[PDB]
Design a protein around this ligand. Structure first.
Ligand code: CLA
Ligand code: CLA
Ligand code: CLA
Ligand code: CLA
Ligand code: CLA
Ligand code: CLA
Ligand code: CLA
Ligand code: CLA
Ligand code: CLA
Ligand SMILES: CC1=C(C/C=C(\C)CCC[C@H](C)CCC[C@H](C)CCCC(C)C)C(=O)c2ccccc2C1=O
Ligand code: SF4
Ligand code: SF4
Lengths: 139, 74, 74, 65, 46, 137, 80, 753
């Protein structure tokens, strides 16, 4: 379970929809030093509590926008975490993936989808006809 | 034919050359251009390459054929 | 009937002409590879595409400026 | 090449392909693209500098003195 | 005053001065010699 | 020989237009000029043919006059642009016209047909293909 | 999902990672550039295809490329 | 003590050094051009003062100084109209024969045959027939000779120089502090009592002492030379008493509250003057006098420096639950509290409201001037009457779009979430999906039940089934509520029984009460409303609601949406957020203004088309000696306007005969401009239907040719930005379409009006 008190919000029309209950939902939790007013990602203003907060959001981009552009940039809050919640109750923490923010290099992270050449050396599509391999995926 | 016929054939010549210009430029730039050197890796019909590098609306070769139909109709 | 038949076959011709260059652009991306066409006449066209496009642009500009200009003068 | 050299870009996908830039610095480590080249003309993104390898450059004028 | 001289050399200012000067030249040519046509230029008035 | 164009002074349709024209500056002298010098169609309006060895100066004078002026403007701009390349801030020389440089470029452009011929013969007119920015093929 | 590839011309400026609105990118240790780091795209399932990363990339040509592919609910940016 | 004058001395030196530094106001533009995009950015950000600096005080000073500059521009333009009406006009000839002379104040030189545009406007004069109504306005002001117009032209130039010096003085010498600009109560008191109130009183003085005496003589039939100069009515009090006996009593009735004595020159008649067709000048004098008292009284409403008055902050902070009406308490327990912060800091929010109200004012001007013609010989001048309505309708539409545009700018730039916590502004944004979804639905309902019934009428008429049409002779749609209002307003003056006994004639003859004719032409007559008027009015309801939908969605979603949650960080004006999320083209609030401009054009085009056809069909015309009226289009609006084939044939095709056949005549300029508007409209489609990616690649090949000849420019040629291409497309689109209608309206009215 995810602990925290929801920010003071009187309700809005930009909240969760059927997708939250059917496919997936996201939760962003953070700790603030004081009670202050922030902007909800989908319009309106809410008041984050004195202690640790918990906000339910429809999309992952809402958490990155709120945590990145408001919590960190404006309120100097650096401990926000984003979870993906499934209808079955399974919850996984997805941001920051390994406890370190992605923009800061961290040891043990592998190279994913790295092409060992400059982009101008991608093969022509005519060479890869009927093979199902895109030019950017070619070895 | 008189002077009135002279001018309209030059209007037709203008239409033929511009419609050819739009089509030929799209065909010859299908592989890529300075704005998008790797256009061939994106296929014939894609929307754009984003607002970066100044903006790339109607940059695919398909878009040139789309623009050429307007000139062919004209 | 004469007007219908002429307009019918000219508009169809214009659509076919657009398709010829549309699938020419598709040929460049999907079916053309520079290795098996190295140095041939097809490769030479791609190597002076700027001259072709710029001169087509000049013909279009010359025709458009003077044909429209003479219309509005009249 | 070296600092102050006037070079011609050979990278095909570069905005300055077959254009001329000025070498600003060369990295002595083993990185892939050690040479920094500055250009008078900005590219479509407004950038006037890029990293190139030695084989992607053609020396056209030695540095002064 | 040198700043005003520098302003007068601006591209829009020079374009306006050039366009106005050329427009005046063409306008006076219409007033002095109206109706000039191809096959008529530089021929004496009948 | 052409028979569907006749001199305007011998076209009854043209004479009808001449008689019915308003008596103002715009029609008094121009109509007289058209009558003596222009060839009119069956509609009574002057037409410009290109099938006459005679009145060839009527074709070559307007063509040569324009080509000299257009070449004069083009050579003024080209020589001015080439002179600003060596400057530290060539872009600043384009939104701020350099009067001493523009006057020098305009003065030389008077003899542009000779200068263009010399540049073409000396190879200075055009830049080499491999030294011009191009896109990947 | 969209496909995001990083090429060897990357200079490790971290600008693409900072610009990503859905945290698709992270910076991983590397040795091909002076910054000793390179961009990676471990979470392309969350990529929406906005191409903010390409806009932020300072190299010429781009060190990071986004190829729009199969559309999913989260790639279409759908809150419903 | 609180309201005071605080300024800074010589805050900005007066030097022309920055004149030679283009783009100095912007940090990015100050470095100089590298591409041609720099040139466009310089002009696009020229007057975006809040991006030049973040100092609100410096911004406000720029607003104040620039406003003096725009006042100088208006005064130069006004001086031009008065000077051209005094030097190149047939104004004196028109004043003698108003009903038989066409007003003209523009004369062209004779160099390329353009002197054909000097039309035979009567009075032994050759020139372009003007449709601005300057002559009718000047006659109502008592002006009778070109010398008086010449004096006003000189005075306008002097005022232009004074305005120009004021802007320089209040920016470079004595620039007020930010505290000065924030005096809401003082500004309202001075602008209500001192600007509107004193101006109405001053103009009432001009009317009573100059306009009424001169116009009374003119309407009596005396010659221009026999009318004494306006100052003679002030010096020689005997003349003024002959015209109106009550001036023999002087100022005594005013100070004794015996104002009924003044009823001879402060009339309350209603209707129109039979001689000229305009409103009674005595009626307008009492109207403006009543306005002056009402505005001056209104100018003592706000508390400035003496305790008495109302406070904006106290009023706003009180308008909340549970202080509201019981059915109006839904605005929440915060209500209008916090809105005062908006007006302290946001210039764009005030510009949004004020532009909206100029749209409201100009719409009232258009509607109320045709139905209640305020100037002599204005109603019968059909060319001027159509032009005045059309011009002010178009000005209103642009102002309304501008109000929505700067409302979106306020949301992106000046809106602060901390200032709006559960207040009405915050609550509106929190049910924006409620508002937009209902607005989207009502737009579809209006479109189906206004336009699709026109398509129903076209199909029924084509089938040869007129009985199944929506028409007066078929399935009737009577606008009973509008018909009821006309009956109520006619019965109010005596022409829900006699609710306005003091007005003799009907307030407007458009509602009923009779017909007024002046020179054998109809000035005003009852405008009956039938099924055709029901359909066209709901067309207006549909088009307006959709224009609201486009603009109001942009304002409500300017901060962001479910698609792009951080549009506020992207700014007010940005092209997109990439092809991702399926494609986010034209999400910013700026493109909602861009899309809303087209819908404003579409809406207002049908408004002026509805006016032009209905007036030509059911109001305007010629009256014979027997009182029989033959209208300009013979009453075809009722049966032809119910289908859009009838609009295509009987309005667009039929009424364009004048402009389509205007070659080789004085109206040939309208014919040329008719084709000019069509060209620019088609030209704009190139920018709207295409994208800069194609054009940038095309420029690459063109740049290659210039590079080949060593003539490539240092300032690199760039295709227009994505937003710039949209701006160019919409600008040429609206210019082309409006010019086409302008030539269409003016050519027809200059021929048959
Ligand atoms: C009775 C006093 C008074 C009057 C008449 C005005 C009038 C005006 N103010 Mg203003 N203002 C006042 C007091 C007054 N203000 C005070 C006390 C404050 C401080 C709170 C302000 C703060 C203020 C701001 C911040 C701004 C204005 C602006 C304006 C102009 C709005 C544009 C318009 O409607 O054009 C009306 C058109 C006219 C031609 C009106 C005449 C213009 C001249 C200058 C008035 C001269 C009248 C004077 C008594 C001389 C009379 C001579 C004769 C009749 C005896 C207008 C001229 C705006 C503007 O455009 O500034 C330039 C603006 O941005 N005012
Ligand atoms: C009192 C009225 C008023 C005032 C003070 C402003 C002030 C402002 N507006 Mg605004 N606006 C208004 C009315 C007003 N507007 C109206 C009525 C509309 C609806 C059309 C708009 C729509 C609008 C948009 C969409 C935008 C602004 C923006 C701006 C800001 C920057 C100004 C700018 O870009 O320079 C103007 C610079 C130009 C180059 C414009 C000149 C080109 C015009 C369009 C051509 C006009 C054609 C001509 C009249 C007829 C043909 C001419 C002939 C030669 C062919 C500034 C705060 C911009 C901004 O960033 O705001 C923060 C912005 O994006 N406004
Ligand atoms: C304006 C251009 C034009 C004109 C005048 C014609 C004229 C003709 N076409 Mg035609 N055609 C054209 C363009 C044109 N074509 C194009 C561009 C296509 C490619 C799609 C075709 C495809 C086509 C086919 C497949 C056939 C014709 C046929 C005909 C003939 C009989 C139909 C007729 O009376 O005229 C046509 C009159 C019109 C008013 C054309 C518009 C008709 C509809 C309303 C257009 C919209 C289509 C639909 C409603 C939208 C999708 C659903 C006639 C000679 C027929 C034929 O050969 O006769 C035996 C036939 O079978 N045409
Ligand atoms: C014999 C002639 C011929 C043949 C065999 C093809 C074959 C092909 N073309 Mg092609 N084309 C042709 C003529 C032809 N074309 C002409 C004349 C033009 C110019 C207008 C084009 C323009 C064109 C473009 C621009 C593209 C193709 C593409 C393609 C390929 C995929 C087809 C597709 O998108 O799915 C089937 C597609 C449809 C069924 C389209 C829906 C119908 C369209 C919208 C017309 C609207 C219908 C209209 C209202 C009524 C028509 C009658 C009705 C019965 C349909 C395919 C190999 C595409 C491709 O290769 O992608 C890389 C592509 O992008 N073609
Ligand atoms: C009426 C509509 C219209 C017009 C006039 C044009 C005109 C043009 N298009 Mg175009 N286009 C249009 C609609 C139109 N388009 C639409 C709807 C589309 C579909 C999106 C396209 C798609 C399209 C493509 C894809 C291409 C063109 C191209 C061209 C150019 C080639 C013709 C030429 O050089 O003539 C000469 C130029 C003209 C006739 C333009 C008018 C010049 C004016 C009259 C000069 C007046 C000067 C005067 C001082 C201005 C007054 C001051 C003012 C600035 C305030 C030309 C600028 C081609 C191009 O750029 O090649 C060079 C090209 O590749 N267009
Ligand atoms: C400075 C002078 C100059 C010169 C010598 C050229 C030369 C050329 N241009 Mg070009 N061009 C120029 C300015 C110039 N351009 C400018 C300012 C523009 C922006 C409107 C263009 C836009 C342009 C296009 C879009 C195209 C060309 C093309 C061409 C080529 C053949 C057609 C032609 O002569 O253009 C005819 C001229 C025009 C099309 C427009 C130019 C007219 C402007 C108003 C002249 C300005 C002169 C300048 C202000 C004088 C300053 C000098 C002073 C400082 C001393 C040729 C290499 C064509 C090409 O590549 O064909 C191979 C082509 O498609 N040009
Ligand atoms: C309700 C206001 C009102 C009305 C109905 C009139 C009516 C008239 N004036 Mg007048 N005038 C007014 C205010 C008004 N004036 C003010 C405030 C001044 C300056 C202080 C003047 C100065 C003036 C002059 C100098 C002249 C006139 C003239 C005229 C006549 C010509 C028709 C006309 O102007 O359009 C009618 C106008 C309207 C129907 C509407 C415009 C009036 C204002 C803008 C309404 C504002 C309401 C606004 C939209 C709502 C604000 C928001 C809200 C929260 C408050 C007519 C009788 C002329 C004449 O000779 O008379 C015969 C003339 O020469 N007027
Ligand atoms: C607001 C502007 C204004 C101005 C400048 C004047 C100015 C004048 N009025 Mg006047 N007046 C006005 C408005 C104005 N009035 C209004 C609104 C009314 C209607 C109540 C009157 C009704 C009025 C009467 C009845 C008389 C004057 C008279 C006068 C003159 C002498 C008054 C005096 O000095 O004591 C003087 C020229 C007197 C005069 O000399 O008559 C010509 C006179 O008998 N006025
Ligand atoms: C004539 C062309 C045309 C038409 C019909 C529409 C239609 C519509 N536009 Mg639109 N638009 C147009 C041109 C047009 N636009 C242009 C040129 C622009 C550029 C500025 C825009 C920009 C624009 C915007 C920005 C917006 C719209 C909106 C709308 C919708 C308004 C709601 C409505 O009227 O529902 C009623 C539907 C109609 C009146 C359409 C005609 C229906 C016909 C008459 C009846 C059909 C009978 C039957 C169903 C047919 C079934 C047969 C079967 C075989 C298919 C509607 C779908 C708005 C919207 O979506 O709000 C809800 C909106 O926000 N449009
Ligand atoms: C045509 C077009 C262009 C090309 C237009 C450009 C590059 C602007 C060209 C402006 C010129 C240089 C202005 C000057 C033109 C005058 C007519 C020149 C007067 C010359 C005198 C001698 C008469 C775009 O860049 C574009 C971008 C995005 C969406 C649509 C479009 C688009 O439609
Ligand atoms: S506006 Fe242009 S660049 Fe942006 S998403 Fe649309 S097509 Fe692509
Ligand atoms: S923005 Fe480009 S250069 Fe910078 S880290 Fe990302 S991929 Fe590498």
């Amino acid at each position: 379970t995810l602990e925290g008190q929801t920010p003071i919000f009187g309700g809005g029309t930009g909240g969760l929809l059927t997708k939250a209950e059917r496919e997936e939902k996201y939760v962003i939790t953070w700790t603030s030093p004081k009670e202050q007013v922030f902007e909800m990602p989908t319009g309106g203003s809410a008041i984050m509590r004195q202690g640790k907060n918990k906000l339910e959001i429809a999309r992952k981009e809402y958490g990155i926008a709120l945590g990145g552009q408001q919590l960190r940039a404006k309120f100097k809050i650096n401990d926000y975490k984003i979870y993906r919640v499934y209808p079955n109750g399974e919850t996984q923490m997805i941001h920051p993936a390994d406890g370190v923010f992605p923009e800061k290099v961290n040891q043990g992270r592998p190279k994913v989808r790295y092409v060992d050449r400059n982009i101008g050396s991608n093969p022509s599509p005519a060479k890869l006809k009927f093979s199902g391999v895109q030019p950017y995926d070619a070895p | 034919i008189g002077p009135g016929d002279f001018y309209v054939h030059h209007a037709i010549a203008l239409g033929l050359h511009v419609t050819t210009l739009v089509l030929v430029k799209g065909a010859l730039d299908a592989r890529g251009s300075k704005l998008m050197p790797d256009k061939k890796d994106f296929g014939y019909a894609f929307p754009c390459d984003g607002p970066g590098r100044g903006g790339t609306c109607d940059i695919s070769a398909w878009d040139a054929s789309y623009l050429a139909v307007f000139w062919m109709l004209n | 009937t004469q007007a219908a038949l002429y307009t019918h076959h000219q508009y169809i011709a214009g659509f076919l002409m657009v398709g010829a260059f549309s699938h020419a652009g598709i040929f460049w991306i999907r079916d053309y590879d520079p290795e098996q066409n190295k140095g041939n006449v097809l490769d030479r066209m791609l190597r002076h595409k700027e001259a072709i496009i710029s001169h087509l642009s000049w013909v279009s500009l010359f025709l458009g400026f003077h044909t429209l200009g003479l219309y509005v003068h009249n | 090449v070296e600092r102050g050299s006037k070079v011609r870009i050979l990278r095909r996908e570069s905005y300055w392909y077959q254009d001329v830039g000025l070498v600003a610095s060369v990295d002595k480590s083993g990185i892939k693209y050690p040479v920094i080249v500055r250009f008078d003309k900005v590219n479509y993104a407004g950038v006037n500098t890029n990293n190139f390898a030695d084989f992607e450059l053609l020396e056209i004028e030695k540095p002064k003195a | 005053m040198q700043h005003v001289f520098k302003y007068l050399t601006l591209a829009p200012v020079m374009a306006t001065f050039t366009m106005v000067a050329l427009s005046v030249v063409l306008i006076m040519l219409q007033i002095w010699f109206p109706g000039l046509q191809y096959g008529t230029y530089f021929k004496p008035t009948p | 020989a052409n028979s569907t164009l006749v001199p305007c002074s011998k076209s009854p349709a043209f004479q009808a237009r001449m008689k019915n024209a308003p008596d103002t500056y715009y029609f008094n002298k121009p109509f007289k000029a058209y009558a003596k010098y222009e060839l009119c169609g069956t509609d009574g309006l002057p037409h410009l043919p290109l099938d006459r060895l005679d009145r060839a100066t009527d074709v070559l004078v307007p063509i040569g006059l324009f080509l000299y002026v257009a070449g004069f403007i083009g050579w003024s701009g080209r020589s001015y642009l080439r002179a600003t390349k060596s400057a530290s801030d060539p872009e600043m020389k384009e939104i701020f016209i350099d009067l001493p440089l523009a006057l020098q470029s305009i003065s030389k452009a008077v003899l542009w047909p000779l200068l263009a011929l010399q540049e073409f013969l000396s190879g200075d007119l055009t830049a080499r293909d491999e030294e011009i920015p191009i896109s990947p093929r | 999902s969209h496909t995001v590839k990083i090429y060897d011309t990357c200079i490790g400026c971290t600008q693409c990672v900072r610009a990503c609105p859905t945290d698709v990118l992270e910076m991983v240790p590397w040795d091909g550039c002076k910054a000793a780091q390179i961009a990676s795209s471990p979470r392309t399932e969350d990529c929406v295809g906005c191409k903010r990363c390409e806009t932020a990339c300072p190299t010429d040509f781009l060190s990071i490329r986004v190829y729009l592919g199969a559309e999913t609910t989260r790639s279409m940016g759908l809150a419903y | 003590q609180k309201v005071r004058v605080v300024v800074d001395n010589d805050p900005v030196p007066t030097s022309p050094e920055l004149w030679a530094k283009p783009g100095h106001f912007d940090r990015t533009l100050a470095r100089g051009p590298k591409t041609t995009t720099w040139i466009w950015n310089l002009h696009a950000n020229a007057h975006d003062f809040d991006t030049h600096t973040s100092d609100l005080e410096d911004i406000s000073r720029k607003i104040f100084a620039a406003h003096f500059g725009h006042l100088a521009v208006i005064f130069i333009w006004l001086s031009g109209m008065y000077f051209h009406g005094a030097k190149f006009s047939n104004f004196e000839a028109w004043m003698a024969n108003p009903t038989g002379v066409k007003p003209s104040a523009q004369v062209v030189w004779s160099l390329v045959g353009q002197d054909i545009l000097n039309a035979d406007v009567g009075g032994g004069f050759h020139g372009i027939q003007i449709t601005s109504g300057l002559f009718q306005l000047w006659r109502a002001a008592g002006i009778t000779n070109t010398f008086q117009l010449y004096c006003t032209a000189i005075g306008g130039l002097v005022m232009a120089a004074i305005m120009l010096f004021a802007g320089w003085f209040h920016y470079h010498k004595r620039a007020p502090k930010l505290e000065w600009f924030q005096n809401w109560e003082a500004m309202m008191n001075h602008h209500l009592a001192g600007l509107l109130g004193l101006g109405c009183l001053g103009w009432a003085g001009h009317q009573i002492h100059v306009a009424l005496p001169v116009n009374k003589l003119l309407d009596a039939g005396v010659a221009i030379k026999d009318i004494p100069l306006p100052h003679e009515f002030i010096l020689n009090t005997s003349l003024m008493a002959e015209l109106y006996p009550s001036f023999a009593k002087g100022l005594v009735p005013f100070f004794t509250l015996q104002w009924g004595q003044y009823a001879d020159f402060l009339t309350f008649k209603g209707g129109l003057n039979p001689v000229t067709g305009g409103l009674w000048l005595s009626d307008t004098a009492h109207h403006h006098l009543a306005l002056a008292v009402l505005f001056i009284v209104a100018g003592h409403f706000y508390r400035t420096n003496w305790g008495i008055g109302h406070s904006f902050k106290e009023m706003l902070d009180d308008a909340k639950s549970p202080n509201m009406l019981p059915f109006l308490n839904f605005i929440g327990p915060v209500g209008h509290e916090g809105l005062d912060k908006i007006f302290e800091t946001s210039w764009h929010a005030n510009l949004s409201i004020h532009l909206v109200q100029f749209g409201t004012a100009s719409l009232l001007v258009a509607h109320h001037m045709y139905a209640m013609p305020p100037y002599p010989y204005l109603a019968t001048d059909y060319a001027t009457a159509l032009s005045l309505f059309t011009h002010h309708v178009w000005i209103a539409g642009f102002c309304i779009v501008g109000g929505a545009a700067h409302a979106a700018i306020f949301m992106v730039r000046d809106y602060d979430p901390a200032h709006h916590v559960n207040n009405i502004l915050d609550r509106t944004l929190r049910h924006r999906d409620v508002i937009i979804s209902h607005l989207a639905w009502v737009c579809q309902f209006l479109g189906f039940h206004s336009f699709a019934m026109y398509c129903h009428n076209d199909t029924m008429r084509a089938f040869g089934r007129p009985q199944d049409m929506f028409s007066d002779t078929g399935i009737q749609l009577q606008p009973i509520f509008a018909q009821w209002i006309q009956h109520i307003h006619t019965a109010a003056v005596g022409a829900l029984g006699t609710t306005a006994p003091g007005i003799g004639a009907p307030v407007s003859y458009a509602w009923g009460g009779g017909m007024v004719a002046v020179g054998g032409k109809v000035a005003m007559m009852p405008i009956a409303l039938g099924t055709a008027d029901f359909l066209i009015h709901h067309i207006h309801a549909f088009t307006i609601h959709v224009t609201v939908l486009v603009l109001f969605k942009g304002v409500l979603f300017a901060r962001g949406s479910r698609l792009v949650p951080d549009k506020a960080n992207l700014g007010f004006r940005f092209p997109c957020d990439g092809p991702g999320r399926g494609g986010t083209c034209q999400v910013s609030a700026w493109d909602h203004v861009f899309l809303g401009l087209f819908w404003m054009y579409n809406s207002l085009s049908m408004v002026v088309f509805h006016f032009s056809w209905k007036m030509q069909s059911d109001v305007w015309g010629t009256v014979d000696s027997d009182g029989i009226v033959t209208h300009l289009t013979g009453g075809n609006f009722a049966t032809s306007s119910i289908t859009n084939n009838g609009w295509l044939r009987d309005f667009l095709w039929a009424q364009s005969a004048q402009v389509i056949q205007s070659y080789n005549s004085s109206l040939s300029a309208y014919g040329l401009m008719f084709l000019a508007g069509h060209f620019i409209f088609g030209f704009s489609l190139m920018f709207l239907f295409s994208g800069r990616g194609y054009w940038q690649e095309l420029i690459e090949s063109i740049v290659w040719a210039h590079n080949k000849l060593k003539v490539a420019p240092a300032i690199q040629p760039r295709a227009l930005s994505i937003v710039h291409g949209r701006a160019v497309g919409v600008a040429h689109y609206l210019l082309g379409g409006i010019v086409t209608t302008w030539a269409f309206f003016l050519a027809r009215m200059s021929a048959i009006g």
